[PDB]
Amino acid sequence: NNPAIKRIGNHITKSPEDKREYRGLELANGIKVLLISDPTTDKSSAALDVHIGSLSDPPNIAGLSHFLEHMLFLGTKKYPKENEYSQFLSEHAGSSNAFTSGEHTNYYFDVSHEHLEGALDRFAQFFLSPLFDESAKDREVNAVDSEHEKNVMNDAWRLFQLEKATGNPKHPFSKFGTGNKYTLETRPNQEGIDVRQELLKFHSAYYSSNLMAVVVLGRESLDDLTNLVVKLFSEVENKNVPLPEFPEHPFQEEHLKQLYKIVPIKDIRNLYVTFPIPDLQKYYKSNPGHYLGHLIGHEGPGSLLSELKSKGWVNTLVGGQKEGARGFMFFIINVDLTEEGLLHVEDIILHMFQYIQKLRAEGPQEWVFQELKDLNAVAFRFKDKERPRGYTSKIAGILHYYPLEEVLTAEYLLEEFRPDLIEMVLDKLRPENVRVAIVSKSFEGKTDRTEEWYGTQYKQEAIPDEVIKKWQNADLNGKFKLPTKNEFIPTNFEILPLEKEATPYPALIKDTAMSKLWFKQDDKFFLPKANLNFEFFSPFAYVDPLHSNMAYLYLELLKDSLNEYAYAAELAGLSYDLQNTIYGMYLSVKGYNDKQPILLKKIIEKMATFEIDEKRFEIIKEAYMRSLNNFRAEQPHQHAMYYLRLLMTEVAWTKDELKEALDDVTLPRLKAFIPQLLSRLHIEALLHGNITKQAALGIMQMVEDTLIEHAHTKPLLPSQLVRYREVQLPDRGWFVYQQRNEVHNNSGIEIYYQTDMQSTSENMFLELFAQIISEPAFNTLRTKEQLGYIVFSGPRRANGIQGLRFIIQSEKPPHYLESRVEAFLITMEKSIEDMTEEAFQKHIQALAIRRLDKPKKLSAESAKYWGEIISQQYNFDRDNTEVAYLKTLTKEDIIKFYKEMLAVDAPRRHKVSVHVLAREMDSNLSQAPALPQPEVIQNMTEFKRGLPLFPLVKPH
Ligand SMILES: O=C(C[C@@H](Cc1ccc2ccccc2c1)n1nncc1CNC(=O)c1ccc(F)cc1)NO
Ligand SMILES: [Zn+2]
């Protein structure tokens, strides 16, 4: 009966396993809405997607849409306090973010379920009368600048913008979307433009209700959620804006048959093949692009990748359709290159067209389409329950593209096989439509062009007629076959009954010298899935840099070897992860439980009986070398976190130590290493999901039996199972470690205040203190002082120890950042002494909500248990215990904690600082306190030698 509602879709197609309730509707002002009712959710959430993006930026103000997106957070007419939005979310267990693409601006938040209306109301205001405060504008432009600078020396962004720069300049596709101080402040000042008017002009003109989709999720009924949404959003004005479309492709004839040679920052070797194609979005019911991408990107036997990998030319391949905008898209084939591959780009591409030609010969395969359909069907039926925040943002995005009743299924289900469209798309993948780009350091000094925004060094050539002609005449290579029927498709979806002796938390159901087995039968989610987690402990995994390298290469080679076999299983919703740790090996198998034992057995056998291919060994090692080198190109704030991890751990091998020892890794030494590594192990496992206790025991026994039979594995001694300790810093100590980032012209800094061994009391002092300072830290260090885009504060936990950490990436020198953080702490000391008891309890409640938030999917709950197990703390009921203690803390308790552990003149202050200087830097408002002379760390080894080591935390 409501006049504010144009239409109400009551049957929203969902999965039969989804317990959440849905109602879609279209408001009178044209807003498409989806309501999600979940009476169990601990956090509520909303999201709004505007169908305008950076592609609609004014030509004279690059990055206006992105900039506008930052500004909406900084105040509205109804809520004028600059950080009201962020502070409210913080005080109620919430959080918020947004992003800008070429065609979308997407805003989202979550919050304690009891405060949805308050959050949603403050949120709705973003879209009616934001302030765009001139003072805030002048500040937040710096955050955007900082965000861009961060991307300037990043190879992904450089190539991203380079593609745009090599097509039609007249086309909106060529726009620089991020923006920076120049395009947002500096140039607009030369040209006398009022940026604040431009923000208001843009907001008013494009942020129309007809271009908006909204998704809200809470405990409230569908009826109540309707009243709430309608009340707040029907007030949004409808300017009846036409939806932008871009019918003309950014790549015209002059832009085809072109080759680009590009110099990267990292030492990487990549080949990009790109085919311009028509917008395939309408064909979404058949999805011709996904069909073709499925085949061209296949990694099993007979595939394009298989042959290229055997030729020793590539290691990995990506293929398929790539989004552009409304009216144009891309089909791409990207491979990485071996040293050999780099000298065979022409032959590689020939092989690409040979495979495409195979597809034309056989023509569309309906069983293939039918297979994809049925997998997606099963995928959708047994879909994991999503986290609200991401779910609402995802859906608010696609409401623009599908009927209300179809949004949930739209991105999952294939409906009708259309070979006519497949052939049509396949017809665009020809040499006369190709663009080729090669990324390699080998082009250094040989380029004649510069992209103006990032400065990328490149050369452009026309592909020779001879070569194009050669590609057009591609004969059928007998090495290329269509994929076989997927043998890993699951068939047994039976949910095993809950055993009588079943337990709420994992139970230790096996405890021998060989292995410690933790088991839980799923009692929450009831999907036909299981998680199998294994830690293999061995001293020889991390005993020195050389052996660390070999543990890595061992597992990489093993994965490279299994890829063809396991790729199918991956498509059938059964994946595995295998990586080396500082304690040995980690192996996880996740997915549909039906065929898990088959893949698991295959992996353990491959481990125990592995025969290294020498050609594969040389290639992977070479890549691993560059991998170590390329760390030089990581962000400063990452270098900072890295160096700190090195400093504070008992044992740690640096990139340089590893890279030197790499040269000494020969095939013989690796072949010797593996049987040595496997000879003595301890296995600690978590088996959690749709399995019974006997099944679990059976799985564990196979793993042991396989290792014993093929590798002659024997148990470790209990005395060999020592975990590493954390360096115990002296009272009132302050150490500083300094490094330079050779790639980036930003500086980084991490500050670590080491409190003490983890324990219920110490844990909750830190966590509560961190909760209280969280929002203020962001608002002060970034929003007010604008030190940088990346500003972070929070707990740090390692080796059973913990402390408070600040992480900042800035253009200012680290020694400056030091004072500002220190200045801030004093600000917080006074702020807390002032805050009301009611405000203090608010934070306690917020922290509690965050800690008690239930896991929504099996993998989240398993990760939670697994954390307790590898940490050797085994505190599975931790949350109830720790939250309960939390509620008994007082303001006076936290003040004592601060005055004793954290304050500048605290008796037990334990501070270490890592400073990463920018590329060009030199060696070195509220009032900042005076700081003591810091002990400059000259040498990590010398540093650790002079300090004691903490104990290890005792198990529960
Ligand atoms: O920049 C953006 C979105 C992010 C930028 C952003 C947000 C969070 C980050 C956390 C760690 C490191 C960098 C980060 C960068 N952004 N843009 N405008 C506001 C925000 C963050 N919004 C918040 O409400 C917030 C965030 C953190 C907090 F503690 C309290 C409130 N889109 O382009
Ligand atoms: Zn941003």
Residue numbers in the entry: 43 to 966, 980 to 1011
Question: Which of the paper's sentences describe this entry?
Answer:
The structure of IDE is atypical with a very large catalytic chamber, called ‘crypt', formed by two joining N- and C-terminal domains. The zinc ion is located in the N-terminal domain, but key residues forming the hydrolytic site are located in both domains, resulting in constitution of the catalytic site only in the closed state. IDE has two substrate binding sites, one at the catalytic cleft and the other at the exosite that is distal away from the catalytic cleft. All of these results are consistent with the recognized role of IDE as major protease acting in the degradation of insulin and Aβ.
Our results show that 1,5-triazoles are much less active than the 1,4 isomers. Our structures provide the molecular basis of why compound 1 binds IDE tighter than compound 10 and 16. The 1, 4-triazole moiety allows compound 1 to complement well with the catalytic pocket of IDE, whereas 1,5-triazole makes compound 16 more compact (distance from the branching β carbon to F of compound 16 is ∼1 Å less than that of compound 1) (9.2 Å versus 10.1 Å). Compound 16 thus needs to be twisted so that only suboptimal contacts are made. The dislocation of the hydroxamate moiety from zinc ion (∼0.5 Å farther from zinc ion in 16 than that in compound 1) explains the reduced affinity. Interestingly, TGS formed the two possible triazole isomers that were shown later to display different inhibitory potencies and binding ability in enzymatic assays, crystallography and 19F NMR experiments.
